[PDB]
């Protein structure tokens, strides 16, 4: 019943993303060497309201080991200086100057990351995540995000939040998120749809009950649904997907032995 | 039956905090007003060097910070690797309350800081400093008398860390956790593995598929203890305590190593407890 290898990714982009993954998956390259390369298609920034490019990145592997960045300036690959985290340091977490300090310690290059059309807008004004099964039965997963969207400098977002963006568990499965920050943050979204399938959910049963779980505390706080987009994509180590959303419009490319596509998710909003 | 109002602490400097959270608990007051006032005390003492004011630095010399609160309605602020004040738990209550936003690091959350009228001090005593030049936490959650949880943790672990690195402190799910419909918990230790485990989040998973707060402390430390073993590691090398709180007042906890004790102060009085360990 197995099926593998398997990547999914969130959005348009993810088809692209997905082509690279594949090259490495395909070849019986590692869950870890996919998603790597998978995210690094994208990453090759809106800036923050001070005009700084500040990018966040996570990586999880088949092993519970884990590498994270956020509000990193300067360096192109956040995803890679996440992996250097993971395999050179004892920590999980570096964040700000330090993880620019280390990055540049290991060799990453520091660049301008803000194009003269950006910075223009900026003026005028005044997320990818991947999770995949190796032909080893071995998960693991990557996500990165570039768009600050004028926010405050040194706001952190879901994506190098381990649990909220993104969360692999070896034994069970993965997860990768969708939607505002701050909502799968205070919800620690990817967690619970693993920890729901490791309660023997499927991925799409996980990923639509965390979803109303998340709608029913939406409510609880006194907001409308309408103002907030949350949203996963799931596996489990059999290969089976899942996905489901707050809101009707998202959509994921997933890539196995049928190829490449992009599918669109259940959704609670009716 | 429920037990409240409530505050447990970690550690055994955690005994004399939850006296100033009871001074806020004992009145009707707040939980969320009654944790922050807690680990404010821990904050503001030079002598806990874990914690705020005091705290030994990174590896550079930089006295950095961490905090994070939740209330019972899911609102949450966070700050992370924050240099030159005092009080990270208020400057993350400040983030809750008055952005939008729910995590602010580095040098944007000192600036937010200053924004909001937090003075700029130096954070590094005379003391911190000598052991540094020679080399070369606190959890509270709380029950109130209205029956809602809150829980604040705030650190400045772990000692000549690289510049930059943050633990479970600041991060909610892994440091801290609230559901005001099922439990609270709160972390501390080797931050790295509760991050890796997200463990508050278990506990409070763990809390609504039916654990006593003690089995979920439990369930979740033994969660950890099997990931150091897959991971090739030694359990000796590790500390990790969790304690928890549901929505009757029932409490528990559970860590790697002994050594560790909590604090809980309940209507009968202040109690220092010594919870049951995995590494036997």
């Given at each position: 019943?197995?099926?593998?290898?398997?990547?999914?990714?969130?959005?348009?982009?993810?088809?692209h993303?997905?082509?690279?993954?594949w090259?490495?998956?395909?070849?019986?390259?590692?869950?870890?060497?996919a998603?790597?390369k998978?995210?690094?298609?994208?990453?090759?920034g809106?800036?923050?309201?001070?005009?700084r490019?500040?990018?966040?990145?996570?990586?999880?592997?088949?092993?519970?080991?884990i590498?994270?960045?956020?509000?990193?300036?300067?360096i192109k690959?956040?995803?890679?200086?996440?992996?250097?985290?993971?395999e050179?340091?004892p920590?999980?977490?570096?964040?700000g100057?330090?993880?620019?300090e280390?990055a540049?310690?290991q060799?990453?290059?520091k660049?301008?990351?803000?194009?003269?059309?950006?910075?223009?807008?900026?003026?005028?004004w005044?997320?990818?995540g991947?999770?995949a099964?190796?032909?080893?039965?071995?998960?693991?997963?990557?996500?990165?995000?570039?768009?600050?969207?004028?926010?405050m400098?040194?706001?952190?977002?879901?994506?190098?939040?381990?649990?909220?963006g993104?969360?692999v568990?070896?034994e069970?499965?993965?997860?990768?998120?969708?939607g505002?920050?701050?909502?799968?943050?205070?919800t620690?979204?990817?967690?619970?749809?693993?920890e729901?399938?490791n309660?023997?959910?499927?991925?799409?049963?996980?990923?639509?009950?965390?979803?109303?779980?998340?709608?029913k505390?939406?409510?609880?706080?006194?907001?409308?649904?309408?103002?907030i987009?949350?949203?996963?994509?799931?596996?489990n180590?059999?290969?089976?997907?899942?996905?489901?959303?707050?809101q009707?419009?998202?959509?994921?490319?997933?890539?196995?032995?049928?190829?490449?596509?992009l599918?669109?998710?259940g959704?609670?909003l009716?």
């Open positions: 019943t197995t099926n593998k290898p398997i990547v999914l990714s969130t959005w348009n982009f993810g088809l993303a997905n082509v690279e993954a090259k490495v998956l395909s070849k019986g390259g590692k869950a870890l060497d998603v790597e998978g995210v690094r298609l994208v990453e090759d809106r800036p923050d309201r001070d005009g490019v500040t990018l966040d990145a996570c990586i999880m592997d088949e092993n519970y080991n590498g994270s960045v956020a509000c990193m300036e300067h690959n956040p995803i890679s200086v996440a992996r250097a985290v993971m050179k340091t920590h999980v977490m570096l964040v100057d330090g993880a620019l280390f540049l310690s060799g990453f290059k660049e301008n990351l803000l194009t003269a059309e950006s910075e223009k807008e900026w003026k005028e005044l997320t990818i991947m999770i099964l190796d032909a080893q039965g071995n998960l693991s997963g990557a996500c990165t995000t570039s768009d600050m969207a004028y926010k400098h040194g706001r952190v977002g879901d994506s190098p939040i381990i649990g909220a993104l969360f568990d070896n069970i499965g993965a997860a990768t998120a969708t505002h920050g701050e909502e799968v943050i205070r620690v979204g990817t967690h619970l749809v693993v729901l399938m309660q023997g959910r499927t991925p799409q049963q996980a990923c639509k009950e965390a979803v109303e779980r998340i709608v505390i939406v409510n609880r706080r006194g907001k409308n649904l309408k103002d987009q949350v949203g996963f994509i799931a596996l180590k059999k290969g089976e997907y899942g996905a489901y959303c707050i009707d419009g998202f959509n994921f490319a997933v890539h196995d032995q049928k190829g490449n596509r599918e669109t998710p959704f609670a009716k």
